[PDB]
Amino acid sequence: AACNGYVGLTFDDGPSGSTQSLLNALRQNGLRATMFNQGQYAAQNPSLVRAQVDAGMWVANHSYTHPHMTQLGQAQMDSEISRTQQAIAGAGGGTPKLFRPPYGETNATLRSVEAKYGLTEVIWDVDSQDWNNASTDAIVQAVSRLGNGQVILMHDWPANTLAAIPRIAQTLAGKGLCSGMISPQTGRAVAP
Amino acid sequence: ACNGYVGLTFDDGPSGSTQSLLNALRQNGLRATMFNQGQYAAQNPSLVRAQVDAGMWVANHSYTHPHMTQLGQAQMDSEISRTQQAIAGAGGGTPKLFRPPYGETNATLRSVEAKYGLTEVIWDVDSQDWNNASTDAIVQAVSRLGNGQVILMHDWPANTLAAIPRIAQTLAGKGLCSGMISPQTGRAVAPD
Ligand SMILES: [Zn+2]
């Protein structure tokens, strides 16, 4: 098949002055992805939140200000998550069903807050390290490790991530894998 | 010796078939997570311990295996709490992992999981061993697993027991080892 399996491409920390270029690259290369936006940036850039939707992306919750959430009390975690639901929905991004904790850091209290808002926690299977100066080569290599169902962490801002997009599409196509959405039931990548 | 880890799991024990399964796993150098029902843990405390003494991890699979999403919250709470108590009381530790019966979940269930400090664990591959899968098919399902991925098997099927040596060979051939399931990510990782 054209798609023998699906992977979860994801981009944290937008939207941003880098977002439109990234979205254009993804669509031109036939890729869809989940954008884990910060609420403060969704609030500041509602038109870019919509641009993600119009590009064929799914929009998800990445907290309001990107704190270390497990260092917060429950009320503060609740504020961070709820304000982000509101900012994304208000901007036309839908009401997210997925949440990625900043730094991947979680605890039972955070889990309770996620459940309150009907959010599935989404970590990752592979960290592209694009936030930690990974080369374009290294990012493409990280994508090459993904199997059916697996999710990769990338970010909205790195230049090497934007440069990687065509080779990411090539890597997936070579393997008979396609870009998929992330199931709120299982947290793994599935057919859109 | 391990290029990566997979999550072997067995639902619905313990049972008159458990000790045979444990012996096969240990003889073939495998470890796994046993998702026990609370009622069977209560009925067979010595077999709960046998799982620990064989090198397995023990997790929560509800008390009576209801369709949890058809229950009220207090009923879900009783099913999960009594299973925590039954497993810990039998010497299986206090579980960190919970698999919903039938893989069926909702936000209410997620809230209850969080209250008890439980990470929800579905699966990446269903072996279909509960649905009359042949030994060949079960081995084939294991062959689809990549690093981090989790497979659903059950404690009782004869073909699952028969499959253990070839499961071990399949994994060893790929440099994959049997791992623990992370409470933070729900992915298979190196045993602690
Ligand atoms: Zn982030």
Ligand SMILES: [Zn+2]
């Ligand atoms: Zn079951």
